[PDB]
Amino acid sequence: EDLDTDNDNIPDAYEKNGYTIKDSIAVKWNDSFAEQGYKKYVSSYLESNTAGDPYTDYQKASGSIDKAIKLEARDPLVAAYPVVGVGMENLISRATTNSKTDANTVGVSISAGYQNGFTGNITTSYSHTTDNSTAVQDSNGESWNTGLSINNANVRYYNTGTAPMYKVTPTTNLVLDGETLATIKAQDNQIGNNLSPNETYPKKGLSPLALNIPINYDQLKKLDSGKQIKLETTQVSGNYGTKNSQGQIITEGNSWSNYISQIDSVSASIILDTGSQTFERRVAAKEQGNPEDKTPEITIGEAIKKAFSATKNGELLYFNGIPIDESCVELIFDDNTSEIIKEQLKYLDDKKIYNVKLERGMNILIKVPSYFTNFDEYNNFPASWSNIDTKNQDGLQSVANKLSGETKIIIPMSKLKPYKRYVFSGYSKDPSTSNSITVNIKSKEQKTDYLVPEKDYTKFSYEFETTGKDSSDIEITLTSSGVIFLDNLSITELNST
Amino acid sequence: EDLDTDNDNIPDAYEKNGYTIKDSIAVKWNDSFAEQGYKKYVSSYLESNTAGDPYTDYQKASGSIDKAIKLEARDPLVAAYPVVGVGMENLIISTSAYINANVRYYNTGTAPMYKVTPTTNLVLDGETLATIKAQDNQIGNNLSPNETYPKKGLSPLALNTMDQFNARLIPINYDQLKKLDSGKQIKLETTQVSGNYGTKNSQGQIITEGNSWSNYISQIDSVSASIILDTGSQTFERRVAAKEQGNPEDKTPEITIGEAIKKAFSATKNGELLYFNGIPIDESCVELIFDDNTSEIIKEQLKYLDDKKIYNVKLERGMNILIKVPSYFTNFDEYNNFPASWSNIDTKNQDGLQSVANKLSGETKIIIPMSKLKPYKRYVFSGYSKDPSTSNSITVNIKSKEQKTDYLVPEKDYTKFSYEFETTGKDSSDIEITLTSSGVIFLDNLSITELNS
Amino acid sequence: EDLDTDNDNIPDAYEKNGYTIKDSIAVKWNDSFAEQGYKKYVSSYLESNTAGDPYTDYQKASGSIDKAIKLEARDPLVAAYPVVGVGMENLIISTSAYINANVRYYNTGTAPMYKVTPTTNLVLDGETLATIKAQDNQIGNNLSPNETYPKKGLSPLALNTMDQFNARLIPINYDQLKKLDSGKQIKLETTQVSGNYGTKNSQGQIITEGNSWSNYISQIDSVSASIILDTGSQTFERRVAAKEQGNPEDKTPEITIGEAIKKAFSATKNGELLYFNGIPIDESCVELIFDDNTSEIIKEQLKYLDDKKIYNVKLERGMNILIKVPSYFTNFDEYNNFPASWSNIDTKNQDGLQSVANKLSGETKIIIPMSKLKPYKRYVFSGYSKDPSTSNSITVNIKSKEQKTDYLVPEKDYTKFSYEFETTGKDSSDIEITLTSSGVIFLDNLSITELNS
Ligand SMILES: [Ca+2]
Ligand SMILES: [Ca+2]
Ligand SMILES: [Ca+2]
Ligand SMILES: [Ca+2]
Ligand SMILES: [Ca+2]
Ligand SMILES: [Ca+2]
Ligand SMILES: [Ca+2]
Ligand SMILES: [Ca+2]
Ligand SMILES: [Ca+2]
């Protein structure tokens, strides 16, 4: 019970069934350590570094590594990985804001009905967080050509990873929405000495970092007609902190380029966006062919909670006081990822996504709803639903709203964003199999569609554009032919037009 | 009791309950040692650097570190940190055109920073004109705590290089000077600083070549709570370590805000009052300012604590704090710096916070000249009010850029009130402050505090 | 009793009670060794370096250091601080324009500095034109204490190199040349100096490459008191270690100011008289100039000491002391350098400071020519008077740019008096100094010294 094959100061028996660190030694995990705040760790007993990151299984579990690393990376299965980028601020004479998911959700196809079991979507242009596309806010309608009519860059580096990056020298190119111009590099005075997780260089409250190119008349027209400029990142070279026997943290020589193709090839990317700040986590997983491989196999639900440090109250996931269970989030998978998920779902009795295994190579994106209401404990709609009744016990989680007649919901434009397209999400139920549902949208895109609830809840998805700050109000019509059950209704924000 | 988990030459029993170093060996803390001048240290027995700073708990307690390190940085809870800023002394621009800037670096932390090469930003209005890094001409070989480079009595160094090997400042086009003539000024902010620190090696020398502070800025910032003390002319910035919220294996000691301020500045305490350099920093004698997150935590923590004082809240990880001593302070006991005496004041009382109170029968009026007031500045009037009757209404009339007329409801016990007003112009109308009382009211610790303009 | 806490080959019993080095090993101090020249050394037993400089207490005491270090730096309580500053000797202005300067580095410390790289500021009036760091052409390989680079007899090295490698120095516009024609001079000051020290490796050869002085500058300054001596034509800076006030764990020896001057200059003492190199530097025979902190510190400490002698006050960390030998000093015993003889002087006395005083009955008037005087300079009148009667008032009439007429009330015992006046213009009115006494007064140790312009 003391044998150590990999020699990482963790006995093999403890490492395969569960262990935790007390007083800098490994102890066998027990059910009684939960209420004390302890966590349960499981890793691979054949590898010193299960995740691939520079820090071994013992250094991460015991925390004997950098203190600027998130607690999320102390799990042996979660890789410490500084996913960084460049955020465009000034266009030179007009500022812009930057969307980290515009270039991902632009390639998502949305229909009305959905196939059984599966409740996500499909993306054809999956991209990471380093793939940054802007959205100009000071463009009030006048063209960029106005002002000269004759035929520099202020940026701010952003981190969304888990581990700090020292000596940050990002490399980007001016892709000018269709053709690259210059593969700019920041050499001597634009280098960030340190870049902590969920922080930018310069820190909040300082003027934008300036980096120091022709533009043709043709790009001027296209930029003035429904196009935006983005500054994609090809690579970023940094360093990281390593302890010593002398005790100093040495971050010269150590690179975040040696381990990147090691971390990347063994970890399954999981991404979550709260609408204001974006996170990217890598979770280790095992390849099917190799029998000697010993990386533990855990569900997505365990992978979600171990990556974003959520809380498992009951059976639903809470992240910073927000429900992030599989029912009130939007999952946007890539092509083969959905093939793996859909193929695995036929044999599962529970038929819930968060209970399926996790394999290396999948690209899961989680997009939290903008406004979501479940009639149970949480609501953030600025106006409540009309004709709300809770005298029920047939809800998806706790209780559903008896849609018998008509319910009106209204939300002003100021609570939304201009030049956007949304997704209407919810679940419907009607055991009678004799009542239909028709819905019409009061917006700049007006459409009416029919649908019928089934025995149990099923997801329905509807979309509409919101373009123009100074426009009319938004009203949604929910008409029921009889006794209709509704629960877990939400709306989201997709790409920008 | 001879164990040593973390290998830092301090037994875990002595490290957990209180210890001090006598003749380069650690001994158990005894309460009779405070009379010999010794201090009581408490630290965490699972970490070699409790604060994340380069020097371990043993080196910080025994004082075997750089001799320029302040004595309040010898606490294993306070982090040795250079907080280096660049202050602009003059600006020169002339003829296209050439701009020349004179700067003088300022250090405020508790550690010297050798070989400083700060990175500064040149910004006019939103746009960062240039991000300049220090060359060989402009590198400060030393910067002692609370000192400047060049030192006092010396001309500041000029900053006029794009790149290495003799480059020159130059605006790109005439647009900058065209808008410069409009009446716009240039600010100066630093994005980052690079320097060294010294460690006495095995050969007895001090090496500052394989060392840098950049390795520890991120670590210090993530395990410590920022605390600032402002004395009007001088500024101080410290960092005090604190335990993680939901961490079972974290052993960083829990201390209160008042104790941490005593530790981080080495301010003496004569029983209850806290004095730094003869200037009180007591809870009621100073105005505390917090950010968004810090205010929420204290308010939540207050309702569960019986004393209901700010200084008794257990310190946590991550808050931001600011302490600004009021510019003009009256307490009717030992300090009255107001240029003009107050009206209708009665010192015969015994119900004040410390020694006496001021019973007011009617109203109090004060005339403040603008001679000693900083023009184009924002000020906040502060004081304590007590009324056992709780049946008198108090209105305030303050003359400023906009006249302020507000009502105040006194409480049973002493309560702190804050009123903000803005005054613009040195040669403007005289500032008038008026307060009236329906009956008899008590006054103590009345102050006017400077704030950002 | 061979305990060694610091492990510097000096047992704690010796280092606390006094020790001296015999045959390169330490032996207990015995009072009979004074006649043979053996000196008494005392230092702190909790630190390898008591003074903080690169060399230990053993190496400083036993002399196993660089042979170019002065003798008085071999004291364990005196640090080996090199104070290097540049000397701006000449100007060359010609075409904007081009500037050329000749400078000569100076050393006035106790230890040499190898590979000197000064940093120089060219300040005209408020603005700083450019900051210059030493090039490979102007890096001085060697610099002995109380010496120069280049050595005496060689022309100064030119200063026309703007930046690294070499580019011609140039004023940026015509504006500074415009005000230069008005009569504005250009000043040069030293912001910093970077240099190496010299230690021996395990193989016996002096290696000076990786060792740098900029490390041991902050440490030595913040652990030692600042002492300066000016001998009229030269200056000598010395820094002496002093204990911390409130530390209970610091065991640094405490010495009087009088002994501090004796150690820091190796000044010989024949009982009470102190000689630097034949020039007396006794407290009564020289006047001292202090800063703010030392002025209030010294006054408070006097009233607790009966003798009331400056040289008998303990040295504490941080004080700044300046010693300026009197340029014109007469004592009527063995020295009188005044060009003109005094009036109404009687040497028949036995109540003087040392042997005799001046039995003045009436008034004394002196005529001082401008042949041996510096125009546009300030001088301070110093001397001692004794009047046991305490019934005669003395008024002084000193001619200067502003005529000075002040009254003096001498005390029963000997008292020092200070009077300030300014001399302007070489071809100006003759300076008249006259003092009158109501009765018979005693005078001794009359001094005149030069101050800043
Ligand atoms: Ca193992
Ligand atoms: Ca392992
Ligand atoms: Ca429910
Ligand atoms: Ca320990
Ligand atoms: Ca420790
Ligand atoms: Ca009181
Ligand atoms: Ca010793
Ligand atoms: Ca020693
Ligand atoms: Ca005499």
Give A232-289 as a 3 state SS string.
CEEEEEEECCECCCCCCCECCCCCCCCCHHHHHHHEEEEEEECCCCEEEEEEECCCCC
**3-state SS class at A396:** coil
Please list, in sequence order, all residues whose beta carbon lies within 8 angstroms of the beta carbon of residue C183, skipping any fewer than 6 positions away.
none
> Are C58 and C9 within 8 A, CB to CB?
yes
Phi, psi dihedrals of residue C137, rounded to the nearest 5°: -75, -20
The tally of CA atoms less than 13 A away on the side-chain side of residue C434 is: 9
Find out whether A177 is annotated in a ligand binding site.
no
β-bridge partners, A122 = A109, A333
Quickly count: other Cβ atoms within 10 Å of residue B370's Cβ. Answer: 15
Largest CA distance in chain A: 79
Nearest ligand, CA of residue A43?
Answer: 2
Q: Which of C119, C131, C200 is the mutation pick for testing B, counting most B CBs within 10 A?
A: C131
Token pair recorded at residue C389: 């009667």
Q: In angstroms, what CA-CA distances link C427 with A104, A310, C380, C430?
A: 89, 90, 21, 9
Q: Which amino acid is at B198?
A: G
Spatial CB neighbours of C372, under 8 Å, sequence gap ≥ 6? C339
CB neighbour list of residue C182: distance below 8 Å, 6 or more residues apart: none
Q: CA nearest B382: which of B286, B308, B249? A: B286
Largest CA distance in chain C: 76
Quick check: C192 and B38 CB within 8 A?
Answer: no
CA quadruple B351, B356, B360, B366: dihedral sign:
negative
Q: Is A449 annotated as a binding residue?
A: no
Phi-psi region of C81 (alpha: psi -120 to 50; beta: other; left: phi over 0): beta
Q: How far apart are CA A452 and CA A450, in angstroms?
A: 7
Contact A166/B127, CB-based, under 8 Å?
no
Length, in residues, of chain C: 453
C residues 84..143 contacting B (CB < 8 A): 119, 121, 123, 126-133
Using the beta-carbon criterion (under 8 Å), do B154 and C189 form an inter-chain contact? yes
d(CA C351, CA C345): 15
As a whole number of angstroms, the distance between CA A183 and CA B395 comes to: 65
Q: Is B67 close to C52, i.e. CB distance below 8 A?
A: yes
Other beta carbons within 10 Å of C263: 19
CB A52 within 8 A of CB A259: yes
Nearest Cα residue to C377 out of C196, C232, C213, C245: C232
> What is the distance of C-alpha A364 from the center of its chain?
8
Three-class HEC string of B322-357: EEECCCEEECCCCCECCCCCCCCCCCCCCCCCCCCC
- Identify the CA nearest to B51 among candidates B210, B217, B200, B208: B217
Integer Cα distance of B256 and C288 in angstroms = 48
How far is Cα A452 from Cα A439, in angstroms, rounded to an integer? 11
The answer to whether the beta carbons of residues C300 and C313 sit under 8 Å apart is no
Smallest Cα distance from A93 to chain B, Å? 10
Of the listed ligands, the closest to the CA of A47 is 2
CA gap A289, A305 in Å, rounded: 27
C212: distance to nearest CA of chain B, Å?
9
Q: d(Cα B83, Cα B73) in Å, to the nearest integer?
A: 13
Which string of DSSP letters, residue by residue, matches B415-442? EEEEEEEEE--TTSPPEEEEEEEEEEEE
CA distance A66 to A163: 8
Distance between A79 CA and the closest CA of chain B, angstroms: 19
B306 Cβ neighbours under 8 A, 6+ residues apart: none
Strand partners, B324: B230, B287
Kindly list the residues from chain B whose CB atom is less than 8 angstroms away from the CB atom of residue C221: 68, 144
Nearest to A171 by CA among A161, A185, A150, A152: A185
Return the SS3 of C81: coil
The residue type at C183:
G
Given CB atoms, is B59 within the 8 Å cutoff of chain C? Answer: no
Q: What share of chain C is helix, strand, coil (3-state, %, to 5)?
A: 15, 35, 50
Those residues whose C-beta lies under 8 Å from the C-beta of residue A178, and which sit 6 or more positions away, are A222
Nearest to B158 among C131, C192, C210 (CB): C131
The helix or strand, by DSSP H or E, that contains position B293, with its residue range, turns out to be: helix B292-302
Tokens of B113: 């920073």
Q: Is C181 labeled as ligand-binding?
A: no
State the pairing for strand pair C287-290/C404-408.
unpaired
Asked if the peptide bond before residue B388 counts as cis, ω within 30 degrees of 0, the response is no
Among C54, C165, C247, whose Cβ lies nearest the Cβ of B205?
Answer: C54
Q: How far apart are CA A69 and CA A84, in angstroms?
A: 15
Contact criterion met (CB below 8 Å) for A206 and B191:
yes
In whole angstroms, how far apart are CA C30 and each of C3, C22, C27, C268? 20, 12, 9, 20
Q: Give the span between the Cα atoms of B140 and A343, in whole angstroms.
A: 65
Residues C156 and C140: their CA atoms lie apart, in Å, by 12
Instruction: Provide the β-strand partners of residue B406.
Output: B396
Which 37-56 residues of chain B touch chain A by CB within 8 A? Answer: 46, 48-49, 52, 54, 56
Q: Do chains C and A touch (3 or more CB pairs under 8 A)?
A: no
Return all residues near A203 (Cβ < 8 A) that are at least 6 apart.
Answer: none
Residues 6+ apart with CB under 8 A from C401: C422, C423, C424
- Please, which residues have CB within 8 angstroms of residue A313's CB and are 6 or more apart in sequence? none
| CA–centroid distance, residue B421 to ligand 7 (Å) | 63
Measured at the CA of A203, the angle between CA A279 and CA B215, to 5 degrees, comes to 85
Take residue B15 and report the two structure tokens written for it: 């490290």
A452 burial via Cβ count (<10 Å: 0-12, 13-18, 19+): middle
The dihedral sign for the CA sequence C308, C310, C311, C312 = positive
Provide the CA C358 distance to its chain's centre, in angstroms. 31
Residues A253, A270: Cα–Cα separation, whole Å: 29
Resolution of the model in angstroms: 3.7
Report chain B residues whose CB lies below 8 A from the CB of A90: 126-127
When scoring B117, B131, B165 by the number of chain A Cβ atoms within 10 A, the one with the most, hence best to mutate, is B131
Six token digits for residue C64 = 């196993």
Angle CA C48–C53–C54, to nearest 5: 80
Class of residue B250 by CB neighbours under 10 A (exposed 0-12, middle 13-18, buried 19+): middle
Tokens linked to B51: 């604060």
User: Which residues of chain A neighbour B223 with C-beta distances below 8 Å?
Assistant: 67
Q: Which helix (DSSP H) or strand (DSSP E) does residue C275 occupy? A: strand C273-275
As a whole number of angstroms, the distance between CA B440 and CA B385 comes to 11
Work out the widest C-alpha separation in chain B, in whole angstroms. 76
B259, C176, B208, B215: which is closest to A241 by C-alpha? B215
CA atoms of B223 and A448, how far apart (whole Å): 56
Instruction: Give the closest of C121, C162, C173 to B94, CB-based.
Output: C173
- For A37, which of B187, B219, B248 is closest by C-beta distance? B248
Torsion of CA C146, C149, C154, C160, to 10 degrees: -140
CA distance B136 to B158: 12
In angstroms, rounded to a whole number, what is the distance separating the alpha carbons of residues B288 and B230? 10
> Cα separation of C65 and C77, whole Å?
15
Contact C42, C253 (CB under 8 A): yes
Give the amino acid at B209. Answer: E
Residues of chain A found within 8 Å of residue B54, distances taken between Cβ atoms:
248
- Considering just the CA atoms, what is the radius of gyration of chain B in Å? 26
**Binding partners of A (≥3 Cβ pairs within 8 A):** B
Centre of ligand 9 to C-alpha C356, Å, is 4
Half-sphere exposure of A494 (CA within 13 A, CB side): 24
CA atoms of C117 and C149, how far apart (whole Å): 12
Q: Which residues in C31-41 are b (16+ Cβ under 10 Å) and which e?
A: eeeeeeeeeeb
